[PDB]
Structure formats: structure tokens, C-alpha cells
């Protein structure tokens, strides 16, 4: 149900390393596809610019440093099985995240942790009601 999570490169590298579930279930199921799909992101300072608001009858305005999330690639998985996805080429320097979209499953992002981000599919279950 997780916040996405941040995180740097290792070796100009960063793994999203994909499990499947239900019922906290370890799923792999080669021919059942999925639409997920994977975007990796990097926080880029654009650098020195200002906000402005009118306050107490006056336009204030502030200089800020801009610093935004932009793209930087995409990932789309394929079927419903245990996989890593490898980004490449990027700038250890630099904080990435990746934010997966995925109808039929809720993304724990579980850690993010010396270039990998972990990420478990929990499927989607519908709320059992008593009798």
C-alpha cells in the first residue's frame, strides 16, 4: 500500500526487484499478464527562481531554488513472475525513485537499498463481509 521510495544508484545502476502475491502469497504465474508499468524518476534542480503570493495587500516574492521530479525511463513488466528490471547509464550522484502503475495489484514498495528498489505486487482482494 506503500509510498514510493527514494533512493541513489550503485555503479551508475538501479534494479527494481519485482515479486507477485496474493494473501501475502509468493505468486509466479508465467502466463497470467500484467499491464504494470515501472518510471523512474529524478528529483533535477532547474536552479534559482522565485515564488510570489500577494500577502497583506502586496505581491510578495521570495527567490526559491526549483528542484522538481522529472522521467527519466520507463520499464513495462509483462506477465505475473518474479523478475529484476536494471536501469542503466544514470548519475550515482543523483536521487532517483520509481513509481509503478499497476491495475489488479497494490505496490508495497517494501526497501531501496544499495541500488535496488524491492517491490511486492499485492493483489487485489475484495473485502470479506461476515454472516
Known sequence: ENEPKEGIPVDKKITVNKTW?????????????????????????????????????????????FVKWVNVDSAKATAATSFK??????????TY???ERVSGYAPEYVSFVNGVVTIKNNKDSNEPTPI
Open 21 to 65: 502475491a496474493v494473501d501475502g502469497n509468493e505468486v509466479n504465474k508465467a502466463d497470467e499478464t500484467v499491464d504494470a508499468v515501472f518510471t523512474l524518476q529524478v528529483k533535477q534542480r532547474y536552479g534559482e527562481g522565485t515564488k510570489k503570493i500577494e500577502y497583506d495587500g502586496q505581491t510578495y516574492s521570495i527567490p526559491s531554488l
Open 85 to 94: 528490471h536494471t536501469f542503466e547509464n544514470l548519475d550515482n550522484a543523483k
Open 97 to 99: 525513485r520509481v513509481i
